[PDB]
């Protein structure tokens, strides 16, 4: 029939698959990220650590150009000193966990580059809107 | 004069009115949704239940096309097996509490339909942006 349990995977379902098939379904890891007298305080400090580290990822996402769009292009070019890999491989050769080792030095340079490339784009949108 | 207390209602003000007059003022139920040694823990588990179930509604809203727009069209058609009602009535005949009984079986089918209709629209926006 229509609707089967084969290609409709679950949480962390495509965790070994290639990036071109992991970016097909990103919402399944997205929605299970917030919901799911001293052992009540083990409940409190487990809950306010979940809603805190969710908001921290929604803030670093927020101050770039991506409010809730969940996939978004940007303006910074890709300097080959970061990864030096071909484009035609890294969407069907590697997998995401193999990528996260391959780049982990160069984050906080990209995250610093993204904020300035947004705030430069933000006021330049205003200067276009101000003259007209 | 200008500015009267008649049509400027309060919290849950239009709760019996029709949908065409309840969607006139939706912000009044919106803004009173977050703000307003053992009975301090009755304060803590009342606060982190308020900010948690607010973020849960802001996440289900977020992964559809509606970041903070508070009224937004979408792309899924309205199958008449859900409601089978006329359009010309349900904005001036019924009221919202009469609607919530009339549809409550068919939620989590609509909420599942909305995520796939966004993520299909999300990557197709990228494939339009990638070729040019």
């Amino acid at each position, epitope marked *: *029939a*229509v*609707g*089967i*349990g*084969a*290609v*409709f995977l*679950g*949480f962390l379902g495509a965790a070994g698959s290639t990036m071109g*098939a992991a970016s097909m379904t990103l919402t*399944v890891q997205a929605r*299970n990220l917030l919901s799911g007298t001293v052992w009540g305080i083990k409940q409190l400090q487990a809950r306010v650590l979940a809603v805190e580290r969710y908001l921290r990822d929604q803030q670093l996402l927020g101050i770039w150009g991506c409010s809730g769009k969940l996939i978004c292009c940007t303006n910074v070019p890709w300097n080959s000193s970061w990864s030096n890999r071909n484009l035609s491989e890294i969407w069907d050769n590697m997998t995401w966990l193999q990528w996260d080792k391959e780049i982990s030095n160069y984050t906080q340079i990209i995250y610093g580059l993204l904020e300035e490339s947004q705030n430069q784009q933000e006021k330049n949108e205003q200067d276009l809107l101000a003259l007209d | 004069a200008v500015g009267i207390g008649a049509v400027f209602l309060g919290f849950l003000g239009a709760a019996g009115s029709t949908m065409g007059a309840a969607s006139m003022t939706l912000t009044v139920q919106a803004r009173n949704l977050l703000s307003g040694t053992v009975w301090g823990i009755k304060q803590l588990q009342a606060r982190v239940l308020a900010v948690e179930r607010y973020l849960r509604d802001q996440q289900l809203l977020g992964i559809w096309g509606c970041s903070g727009k508070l009224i937004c069209c979408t792309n899924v058609p309205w199958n008449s*097996s859900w409601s089978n009602r006329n359009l010309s009535e349900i904005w001036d005949n019924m009221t919202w509490l009469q609607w919530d009984k009339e549809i409550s*079986n068919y939620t*989590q*089918i609509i*909420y*599942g339909l909305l995520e*796939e209709s966004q993520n*299909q629209q999300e990557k197709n926006e990228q494939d339009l942006l990638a070729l040019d």
Partner: antibody
């Protein structure tokens, strides 16, 4: 409308291999978001899933009772869906349904079912 | 393997009286995406099986209210409300929640 015709030997010998082809008329087998499957059914004894294939990832699946002997391949040169089953036994006497299943309602809301070829093993 | 048992074996139903065919899985069939992956099929003898009820308590695009789907986790009932002459055949319960797909043993309904 994709019409699925099936072909194969009606008399299959013991201890040899069985080869069944599923002709794809009115369309291509490489059409996206469809699940191509073989389904057997003994007469009046219930349906049984043999195996399947999703086109977009080239993922062949089988029945865990029957992973060992079934090899499923795609014949793009003749637009056919292929089944090869070695050491065929008496419990494989069944009618073979070739089923194309849409995984999403954007691809289709009602799947198609083949005419079915009854294959009985004898000498 | 998960077991799909069908009750009863065969029913001789009168045209008009509500008929019920039940099938029970080995575990619950509710998935996190929001759909219950339990299905029901109609088969005539000498005819390929056709889907009747997908995503139960919702009708398909072409079947009337003569068929119905209800139940909960591990308990599934197919209800035939109004019986016609074409209602005869063998019905099958089948899960599309997990791999593999397992089918029912078959429930024959005949005419009196």
């Amino acid at each position: 409308q994709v019409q699925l015709q099936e072909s194969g030997p009606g008399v299959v010998k013991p201890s040899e291999t069985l080869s069944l082809t599923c002709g794809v008329s009115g369309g291509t087998i490489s059409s996206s978001h469809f699940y191509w499957s073989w389904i057997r059914q003994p007469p009046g004894k219930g349906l049984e899933w043999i195996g399947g294939l999703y086109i977009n990832d080239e993922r062949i699946n089988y029945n865990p009772s029957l992973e060992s002997r079934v090899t499923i391949s795609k014949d793009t040169s003749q637009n056919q869906f292929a089944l090869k089953l070695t050491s065929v036994t008496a419990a494989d006497t069944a009618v073979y349904y070739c089923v194309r299943e849409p995984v999403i309602a954007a691809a289709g809301t009602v799947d198609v079912w083949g005419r079915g070829v009854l294959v009985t093993v004898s000498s | 393997d998960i077991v799909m048992t069908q009750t009863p074996l065969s029913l001789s139903v009168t045209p008009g009286e509500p008929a019920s065919i039940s099938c029970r899985s080995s575990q619950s069939l509710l998935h996190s995406n929001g759909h219950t992956y339990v299905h029901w099929y109609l088969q005539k003898a000498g005819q390929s099986p056709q889907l009747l009820i997908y995503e139960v308590s919702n009708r398909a695009s072409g079947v009337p209210d003569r068929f119905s789907g209800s139940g909960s986790g591990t308990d599934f009932t197919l209800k035939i409300s109004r019986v016609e002459a074409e209602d005869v055949g063998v019905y099958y319960c089948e899960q599309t929640l997990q791999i593999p797909f397992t089918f029912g043993g078959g429930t024959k309904v005949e005419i009196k």
